[PDB]
Amino acid sequence: RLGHECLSDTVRTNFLQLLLQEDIYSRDFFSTLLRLCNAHSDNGELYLRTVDIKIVDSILSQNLRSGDWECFKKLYCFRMLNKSERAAAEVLYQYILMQADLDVIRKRKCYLMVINVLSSFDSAYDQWILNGSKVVTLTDLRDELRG
Amino acid sequence: HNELIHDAVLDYYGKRLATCSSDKTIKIFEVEGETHKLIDTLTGHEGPVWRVDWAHPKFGTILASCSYDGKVLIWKEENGRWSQIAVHAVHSASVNSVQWAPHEYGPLLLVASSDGKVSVVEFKENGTTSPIIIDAHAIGVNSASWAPATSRKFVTGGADNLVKIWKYNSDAQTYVLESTLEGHSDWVRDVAWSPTVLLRSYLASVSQDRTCIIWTQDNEQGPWKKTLLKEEKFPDVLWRASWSLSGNVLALSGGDNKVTLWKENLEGKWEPAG
Amino acid sequence: SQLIFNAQALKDRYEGNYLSEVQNLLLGSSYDLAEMAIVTSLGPRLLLSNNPVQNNELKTLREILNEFPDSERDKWSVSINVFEVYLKLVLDNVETQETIDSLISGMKIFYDQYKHCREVAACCNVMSQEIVSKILEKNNPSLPLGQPEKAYLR
Amino acid sequence: LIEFPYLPKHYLVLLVAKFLYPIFLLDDKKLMDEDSVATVIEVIETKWDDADEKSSNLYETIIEADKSLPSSMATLLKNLRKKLNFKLCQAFM
């Protein structure tokens, strides 16, 4: 968490990729990595409550693709790239499926809980606009329940 | 089912068709010729289905669907999938008519039911159905076709046997009883107003008496004139009536399969024609 | 010629490719009242191709609005430039306390406007979310509760 | 042991309502259950696939004497999403 003029002691902000190159081999930070207030989110890394935005959706993503280790930087989060309102709740579930193959767990875990966001409006308007509903364009990934 | 079919009516484009039956569904079979193509089987009903109608297109194509149970299901494609966007179930008894207003008028579906009622479904500002309850026939209203321009107008067909003409006024807010007709003696099946492209409307008010009484208005301000399609009781009982968009040609199929292309000629004779 | 072109975009309209021919009511450019009808296509799918060339192209689409003849008591552009002042706070960062914009006001007019369809009411909630740190959300973000995010203020 | 027709399983929707909202699943974060995070993910599979399980003779006025989240706190088994997401933590894969 780097303030609003305390981002000049990390004027290298792509250094925060490189902190996290050797930092995580371990689960000891991921708890604070969901969009939740100061409670659950101050034990480990920064809070996604009031924080600047590069810190979020540039810094954590550029590290996220890189295989630097946790299995919980391939899986867990669902509000890690929420700093943007109901957003990467839909599409960090398929962020799983972009790194890794579509297979069993990674299939029907992520289609059952996202289809009661994306047809609990239930006529298939686009909610979080960049992938939208689960039945305009992942109706293929709702027959992959079986299999 | 598709073997004791009771309706199959097209949209104004003629490219979309919806066929219902005793299937308790609406099997959507659009026109590609005498081949048609399934797009979805709409299950929502319980019991025999009587009438469907697509919308006249200026307010989508939107399929109503009236049925035994009490229910008129507003179906609409919204992002290439269907969703019953409203329910219009204010009836208990068999719902027997659904017919949209023509896109010379605005959004005004006409629901009729043999519980006693006509219902002029008012589409609100999310497509939220809200009817004003009216009565035409107090035995039951078995049919309800619209009167377009050859303000707003329609016709309903009796289980009291009367064929009441209904005409809209905006200083009393409802359909004023315009006139009342009767040459009928068993119940009305279908009241079909002609869509002539000029001042003229005949009304083949189809009856169970084994007779169809064509009321004729030579021009609209000429009165309703009693004539018969033929002047005898038919051997069998008479089904659905239509009138063309241009020519005003009658088309009905009988019980013995009476093909009807009998249009009124010079001499005033319902005369066999092409 | 033009009449057959104004029946083409009523004919070839279907509910799958509603937007194809409601676009050829917009860009048809002999029409009027296509200005909130595009809004019943592009509200249920504000999905586009989401670059500054589609958005600058969508600028060119809300100038078609002013090309239409201006009716008695109908035709306005003071709440339809809502979706065009949206395309000016999405290429710009700057927290707006309405020193800039008619656009949080514009959403609130767009929860007294939405007419035809309550997914035309819920897109008003989705365009709330796409502009976070650039608004403080005096509208709502978008049964499905678990993660609406209630923290975006500074 | 009872994966037959025999004993029907439509009781398991009154029963487990305020089982799974209290501490027997999880209602904190990082709780693990012994052989029973991997056999309760396959009956809430059912309840999001098509439809929640049947009873509503005694669960559509008994959830409001239980004080369960679906009919009472407006939010459905999207709060048993929350109570599986809070053991994607580090207590289920």
Swiss-Prot record, chain A:
Source domain of life: Eukaryota
Location in or out of the cell: Nucleus, Nuclear pore complex; Nucleus membrane
Description of how the protein assembles with itself and partners: Component of the nuclear pore complex (NPC). NPC constitutes the exclusive means of nucleocytoplasmic transport. NPCs allow the passive diffusion of ions and small molecules and the active, nuclear transport receptor-mediated bidirectional transport of macromolecules such as proteins, RNAs, ribonucleoparticles (RNPs), and ribosomal subunits across the nuclear envelope. Due to its 8-fold rotational symmetry, all subunits are present with 8 copies or multiples thereof.
Role summary: Functions as a component of the nuclear pore complex (NPC). NPC components, collectively referred to as nucleoporins (NUPs), can play the role of both NPC structural components and of docking or interaction partners for transiently associated nuclear transport factors. NUP120 is involved in nuclear poly(A)+ RNA and pre-ribosome export, in GSP1 nuclear import, in NPC assembly and distribution, as well as in nuclear envelope organization.
Protein name stated in the entry: Nucleoporin NUP120
Organism of derivation: Saccharomyces cerevisiae (strain ATCC 204508 / S288c) (Baker's yeast)
Shown segment, full-protein numbering: 890 to 1036 of 1037
Curated annotation (Swiss-Prot), chain B:
Gene Ontology cellular-component annotations: cell periphery; COPII vesicle coat; endoplasmic reticulum; endoplasmic reticulum membrane; nuclear envelope; nuclear pore; nuclear pore outer ring; Seh1-associated complex
Topology in the lipid bilayer: Peripheral membrane protein
Ranges of the WD repeats in the UniProt entry: 1-39, 44-85, 90-131, 136-176, 183-225, 233-272
Keyword vocabulary terms for this entry: Cytoplasmic vesicle, Endoplasmic reticulum, ER-Golgi transport, Membrane, mRNA transport, Nuclear pore complex, Nucleus, Protein transport, Repeat, Translocation, Transport, Vacuole, WD repeat
Taxonomic superkingdom: Eukaryota
GO biological process: COPII-coated vesicle budding; ERAD pathway; mRNA transport; nuclear pore localization; nucleocytoplasmic transport; positive regulation of DNA-templated transcription; positive regulation of ER to Golgi vesicle-mediated transport; positive regulation of protein exit from endoplasmic reticulum
Chief place where the protein resides: membrane
Subcellular location: Cytoplasmic vesicle, COPII-coated vesicle membrane; Endoplasmic reticulum membrane; Nucleus, Nuclear pore complex; Vacuole membrane
GO molecular function, one term: structural molecule activity
Impact noted for substituting residue 243 to R: Growth inhibited above 30 degrees Celsius
Pfam families xref list: WD40 (PF00400)
Outcome reported for the amino acid change (mutating residue 157 to R): Leads to mislocalization of NPCs and overproliferation of the nuclear and ER membranes at 34 degrees Celsius
Family according to the record: Belongs to the WD repeat SEC13 family.
Any further remark recorded for this protein: Present with 21400 molecules/cell in log phase SD medium.
Designated name of the protein: Protein transport protein SEC13
Species of origin: Saccharomyces cerevisiae (strain ATCC 204508 / S288c)
UniProtKB/Swiss-Prot annotation, chain C:
Annotated localization: Nucleus, Nuclear pore complex; Nucleus membrane
Membrane-protein topology: Peripheral membrane protein
Residues annotated as transmembrane: none
Name listed for the protein in its UniProt record: Nucleoporin NUP145C
Source species taxonomy: Eukaryota, Fungi, Dikarya, Ascomycota, Saccharomycotina
UniProtKB/Swiss-Prot annotation, chain D:
Subcellular locations according to the entry: Nucleus, Nuclear pore complex; Nucleus membrane
Signal peptide, first to last residue: none
Superkingdom field: Eukaryota
Miscellaneous comment text of the record: Present with 7920 molecules/cell in log phase SD medium.
Primary role: Functions as a component of the nuclear pore complex (NPC). NPC components, collectively referred to as nucleoporins (NUPs), can play the role of both NPC structural components and of docking or interaction partners for transiently associated nuclear transport factors. NUP85 is involved in nuclear poly(A)+ RNA and pre-ribosome export, in GSP1 nuclear import, in NPC assembly and distribution, as well as in nuclear envelope organization.
Family listed: Belongs to the nucleoporin Nup85 family.
Assembly, per entry: Component of the nuclear pore complex (NPC). NPC constitutes the exclusive means of nucleocytoplasmic transport. NPCs allow the passive diffusion of ions and small molecules and the active, nuclear transport receptor-mediated bidirectional transport of macromolecules such as proteins, RNAs, ribonucleoparticles (RNPs), and ribosomal subunits across the nuclear envelope. Due to its 8-fold rotational symmetry, all subunits are present with 8 copies or multiples thereof.
Entry protein name: Nucleoporin NUP85
Lineage summary: Eukaryota, Fungi, Dikarya, Ascomycota, Saccharomycotina
